[PDB]
Design a protein around this ligand. Structure first.
Ligand SMILES: NS(=O)(=O)c1ccc(CCNC(=O)Cc2ccc(O)c(Cl)c2)cc1
Ligand SMILES: [Zn+2]
Length: 257
């Protein structure tokens, strides 16, 4: 099916998923000098105190740390968001080299990786229904640069050996996602889509200005994962990012000056 190779990559997705050339596709390049400061935006509220992580899965495209979203245990509110959005999972997109890997770019600059904390609007009952709504999801994006290690990410790095191939999963309870956040919550926001098929245009993107630093050794372990399943020829899971798409008729708002 779809992937990140030369024959099934982003350039090919539009054939099976025509929405790939849609009105509000993601990611996009964030031109910092074109974004408009919006004084009406309310403070962003990240409430992850009662977060309940459950499992980590290699789905052949990336790895997901899944949470229990049967109640409002971990939610995102405020900012450009109306209502409550529950955290369902988080994952990353990364490159084969430190100079590439992120999906969104800042003034054309590419980061080593990008973290996506996915949340769904509770007004819609379940994730499946939410992806069919223009304001169904809220994804918090965090850029990762290479430098000093991120203590809060090590627990994720150390379990990757147990889910090397597609389809593999492992118990991953008691993980605190608050350990992956930077100091500042300053952000940029715009209406977009999922960055992978089905590419549904149901996302309110909130991208933080401040990146987090991770060590070369931590990102190197991300690159040892496989796109393939067990017993199959090895294809390293690297460069699983979609490039920037046309902004078209959209405006990016900033929470800061
Ligand atoms: N890179 S990104 O923009 O943050 C991002 C985030 C999340 C997704 C997963 C979307 N999955 C489905 O749509 C399948 C589904 C369909 C019905 C369901 O009930 C359930 Cl649970 C799942 C893709 C990309
Ligand atoms: Zn993503």
């Amino acid at each position: 099916h779809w992937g990140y190779g030369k024959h099934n990559g982003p350039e090919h997705w539009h054939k099976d998923f025509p929405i790939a050339k849609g009105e509000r596709q993601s990611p996009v390049d964030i031109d910092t000098h074109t974004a408009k400061y919006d004084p009406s935006l309310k403070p962003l509220s990240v409430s992850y105190d009662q977060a309940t992580s459950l499992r980590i899965l290699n789905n052949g495209h990336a790895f997901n740390v899944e949470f229990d979203d049967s109640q409002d245990k971990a939610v995102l509110k405020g900012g450009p968001l109306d209502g409550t959005y529950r955290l369902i999972q988080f994952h990353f997109h990364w490159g084969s080299l430190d100079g590439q890997g992120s999906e969104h770019t800042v003034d054309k600059k590419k980061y080593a990786a990008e973290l996506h904390l996915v949340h769904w609007n509770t007004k819609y009952g379940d994730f499946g229904k939410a992806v069919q709504q223009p304001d169904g999801l809220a994804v918090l994006g965090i850029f990762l640069k290479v430098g000093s290690a991120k203590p809060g990410l090590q627990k994720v790095v150390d379990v990757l050996d147990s889910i090397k191939t597609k389809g593999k999963s492992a118990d991953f309870t008691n993980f605190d996602p608050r350990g992956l956040l930077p100091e500042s919550l300053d952000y940029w926001t715009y209406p977009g889509s999922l960055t992978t098929p089905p590419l549904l245009e149901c996302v309110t993107w909130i991208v933080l200005k401040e990146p987090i630093s991770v060590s070369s050794e931590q990102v190197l372990k991300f690159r040892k994962l496989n796109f393939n399943g067990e017993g199959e020829p090895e294809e390293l899971m690297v460069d699983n990012w979609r490039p920037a798409q046309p902004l078209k008729n959209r405006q990016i708002k900033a929470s800061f000056k």
